[PDB]
Amino acid sequence: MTEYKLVVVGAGGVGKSALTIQLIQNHFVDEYDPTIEDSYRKQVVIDGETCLLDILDTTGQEEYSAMRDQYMRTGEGFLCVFAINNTKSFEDIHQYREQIKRVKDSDDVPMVLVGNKCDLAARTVESRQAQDLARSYGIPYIETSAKTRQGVEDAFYTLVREIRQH
């Protein structure tokens, strides 16, 4: 069937893994389990098309950038994740977007900006900021809670449709 290689990138601890588990295994981790590189493959139906998501859950460890490039070079679509309560992770979003474009040799590669943890109250990144940033990239912005599963399906599915339209 159709295969979509989706890549989840972001700063350490933003919720990359929790978002992916919530999509696939319908539960919230709530647990310290730092990724190195994990892969998930799952047959879905999106808008009536049977497809397979091959999802690569990367790490935010700085020590691991080359491995990230190698796996990132495969991606069709990318979720660039920060946490709405961690300004640094929002700041690091620019470095991920650029590493992605060098590694993909493209400026318009499919991509969603994801503001995770919108269940939290200690918001330090206002939504208007990320909207502007996602506007300047010509990519969508979607807020997620991996805890409450809100926006999770939205964000992946929107990437899938970004990819089909490319």
Dist CA 45 CA 162 (whole Å): 16
Closest to 60 measured CA to CA, from 107, 120, 17: 17
Residue 48 Ramachandran class (φ > 0 left, ψ -120 to 50 alpha, else beta) = left
56 binds, among ligand GNP, Mg ion, none (CB under 5 to 8 A by kind): none
- Binding residues with ligand GNP: total (CB under 6 A): 24
According to the binding rule CB under 6 A, does residue 35 interact with ligand GNP? yes
Work out the angle between the directed axes of helices 87-104 and 65-72 (0-180°, nearest 10).
50
According to the binding rule CB under 6 A, does residue 124 interact with ligand GNP? no
Quote the least distance from Cβ 23 to ligand GNP, whole Å. Answer: 12
According to the binding rule CB under 6 A, does residue 16 interact with ligand GNP? yes
Tokens of residue 96, six digits: 């991920």
Closest to 39 measured CA to CA, from 53, 56, 59: 56
Angle at 16 between CA 100 and CA 135, to 5 degrees: 50
60 binds, among ligand GNP, Mg ion, none (CB under 5 to 8 A by kind): ligand GNP
The stretch among 35-43, 74-82, 125-133, 158-166 that binds Mg ion (CB under 5 A) is 35-43
According to the binding rule CB under 5 A, does residue 35 interact with Mg ion? yes
Coil, helix or strand at residue 120: coil
Nearer to ligand GNP, 51 or 146 (CB): 146
Dist CA 155 CA 136 (whole Å): 19
The stretch among 11-19, 42-50, 121-129, 134-142 that binds ligand GNP (CB under 6 A) is 11-19
The stretch among 32-40, 41-49, 98-106, 126-134 that binds ligand GNP (CB under 6 A) is 32-40
Binding site residues, ligand GNP, CB under 6 A:
10, 12-18, 29-35, 59-60, 116-117, 119-120, 145-147
Binding site residues, Mg ion, CB under 5 A:
16-17, 35
